[PDB]
Amino acid sequence: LPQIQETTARIIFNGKDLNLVERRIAAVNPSDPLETTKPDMTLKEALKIAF
Amino acid sequence: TPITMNYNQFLELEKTKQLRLDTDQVYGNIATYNFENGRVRVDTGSNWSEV
Amino acid sequence: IYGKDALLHEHYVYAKEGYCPVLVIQSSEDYVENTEKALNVYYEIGKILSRDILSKINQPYQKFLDVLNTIKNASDSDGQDLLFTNQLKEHPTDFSVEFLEQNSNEVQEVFAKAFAYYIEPQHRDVLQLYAPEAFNYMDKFNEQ
Amino acid sequence: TVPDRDNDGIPDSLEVEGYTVDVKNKRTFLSPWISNIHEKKGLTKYKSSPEKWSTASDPYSDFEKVTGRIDKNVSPEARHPLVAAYPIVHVDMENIILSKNED
Amino acid sequence: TVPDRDNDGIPDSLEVEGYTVDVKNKRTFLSPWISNIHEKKGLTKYKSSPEKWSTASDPYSDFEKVTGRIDKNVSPEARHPLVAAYPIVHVDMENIILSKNED
Amino acid sequence: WSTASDPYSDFEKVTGRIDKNVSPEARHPLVAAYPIVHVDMENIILSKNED
Numbered sequence: 419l420p421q422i423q424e425t426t427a428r429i430i431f432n433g434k435d436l437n438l439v440e441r442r443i444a445a446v447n448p449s450d451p452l453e454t455t456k457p458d459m460t461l462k463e464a465l466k467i468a469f
Numbered sequence: 470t471p472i473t474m475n476y477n478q479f480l481e482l483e484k485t486k487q488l489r490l491d492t493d494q495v496y497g498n499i500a501t502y503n504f505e506n507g508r509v510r511v512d513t514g515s516n517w518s519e520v
Numbered sequence: 521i522y523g524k525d526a527l528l529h530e531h532y533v534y535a536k537e538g539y540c541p542v543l544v545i546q547s548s549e550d551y552v553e554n555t556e557k558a559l560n561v562y563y564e565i566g567k568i569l570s571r572d573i574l575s576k577i578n579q580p581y582q583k584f585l586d587v588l589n590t591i592k593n594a595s596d597s598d599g600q601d602l603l604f605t606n607q608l609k610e611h612p613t614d615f616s617v618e619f620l621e622q623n624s625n626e627v628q629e630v631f632a633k634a635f636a637y638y639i640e641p642q643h644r645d646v647l648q649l650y651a652p653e654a655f656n657y658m659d660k661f662n663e664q
Numbered sequence: 665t666v667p668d669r670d671n672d673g674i675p676d677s678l679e680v681e682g683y684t685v686d687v688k689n690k691r692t693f694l695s696p697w698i699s700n701i702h703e704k705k706g707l708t709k710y711k712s713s714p715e716k717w718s719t720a721s722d723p724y725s726d727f728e729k730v731t732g733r734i735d736k737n738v739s740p741e742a743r744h745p746l747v748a749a750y751p752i753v754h755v756d757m758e759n760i761i762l763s764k765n766e767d
Numbered sequence: 768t769v770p771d772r773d774n775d776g777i778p779d780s781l782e783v784e785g786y787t788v789d790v791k792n793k794r795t796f797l798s799p800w801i802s803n804i805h806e807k808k809g810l811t812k813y814k815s816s817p818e819k820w821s822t823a824s825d826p827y828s829d830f831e832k833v834t835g836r837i838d839k840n841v842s843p844e845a846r847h848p849l850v851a852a853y854p855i856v857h858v859d860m861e862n863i864i865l866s867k868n869e870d
Numbered sequence: 871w872s873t874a875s876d877p878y879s880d881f882e883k884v885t886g887r888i889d890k891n892v893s894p895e896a897r898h899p900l901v902a903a904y905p906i907v908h909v910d911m912e913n914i915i916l917s918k919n920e921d
């Protein structure tokens with residue numbers, strides 16, 4: 419769990435019946451060389467695949 | 470079993486209200502990276518006492 | 521449990537000191553290998569493949585037209601747009617691939633596409649899905 | 665021999681450039697992405713790390729997550745490799761019971 | 768075969784003379800220091816021991832620390848090999864509760 | 871393998887690949903390295919078990 423928390427962006431959304439839904443999506447930390455090996459994530463793509 | 474205090478220490482505590490707490494040593498383990506699957510795993514054998 | 525970074529390309533030294541430096545090594549890095557280059561190659565393989573003065577032993581229909589017609593059969597009866605892409609639409613019949621007039625439009629694309637079908641190990645994994653229908657064509661190319 | 669530095673059973677160029685999984689007859693085939701042989705089928709183009717066995721760092725590989733060889737209790741929207749899969753557990757308290765230890 | 772006495776996956780002359788991890792593509796590549804290129808990119812020149820698997824003797828290699836294949840809870844300023852990474856834990860006491868065992 | 875028969879080789883002791891808490895004068899191979907532990911007692915607490 420701390421490995422996930424330190425490497426992802428967290429998005430909370432409550433449009434499904436006013437209930438807080440949390441999703442973590444892998445996104446790039448520029449100061450970490452291994453973390454930069456991921457493909458880039460736009461916000462719209464993230465909202466499309468996550469929700 | 471809960472912590473026990475005798476009579477004279479009880480009187481001295483209710484008189485002086487001086488009860489301090491010391492941190493002598495801390496046990497705790499290291500999780501190391503695995504080159505196999507990328508998963509950082511805890512070695513329960515090793516501790517920071519070695520390090 | 522294994523060797524870390526077996527490429528051992530460190531011994532190689534890169535110069536090109538100055539503005540707009542460009543480095544090219546057998547290993548292939550920077551402007552050498554990229555997704556855009558692969559995308560450009562996909563456009564290149566699909567239409568007028570190979571910009572070199574001369575290519576392979578065969579661009580004629582004298583020996584390469586009968587084999588293409590014989591190979592043009594699908595057991596699954598699919599391969600829609602997957603094959604003759606941008607051919608003023610896949611022909612429902614086309615009278616079994618023997619007419620040239622108002623048809624040589626996609627013949628050049630089809631011959632170029634055939635080279636694209638079996639080029640390097642990667643494409644083989646893609647072409648591995650085609651299984652037997654493509655293999656027959658690949659075996660003839662392998663025999664050469 | 666095609667490289668897979670992340671050792672997750674899926675090569676590096678496919679994870680970079682895009683790929684998909686498609687059944688043909690009864691068999692899953694890991695294709696690279698072709699927009700004229702997949703997009704029509706509605707298959708989702710996948711990208712992930714060439715050096716992460718698990719790109720989302722969850723205890724599930726990229727290949728297991730795209731193949732389906734996973735714990736099926738994972739939610740379907742977590743079957744994308746860039747989507748993390750993790751439990752969120754919290755405890756609620758419905759009732760108290762106090763008993764007076766009086767004899 | 769290039770030597771690495773410290774067995775940390777990174778050769779000895781590079782740790783002596785300076786090196787940097789610059790990624791031309793998605794994949795990560797470690798290589799010797801060149802001031803014409805890596806200085807313009809802002810990359811930090813790294814030196815470490817040719818005989819220490821961990822030059823700071825913390826339970827993390829030099830290569831893991833420069834690559835990023837590490838516990839990410841390590842602070843970023845501890846990602847330099849000459850910077851140690853270690854916890855400092857001390858306990859504070861917010862409140863006392865004494866109960867008189869009188870019946 | 872250990873000329874002083876302590877649990878450290880001759881080579882580890884001259885190389886430095888050793889527990890660094892070993893004193894520097896014990897880094898010579900003919901010098902033994904061993905702990906000497908004894909316990910002191912600072913205070914007594916007696917409680918009369920009388921009800």
Ligand SMILES: [Ca+2]
Nearest residue numbers: 668670674675
């Ligand atoms: Ca892979």
Ligand SMILES: [Ca+2]
Nearest residue numbers: 670713716717
């Ligand atoms: Ca991967």
Ligand SMILES: [Ca+2]
Nearest residue numbers: 771773777778
């Ligand atoms: Ca080394």
Ligand SMILES: [Ca+2]
Nearest residue numbers: 773816819820
């Ligand atoms: Ca070293």
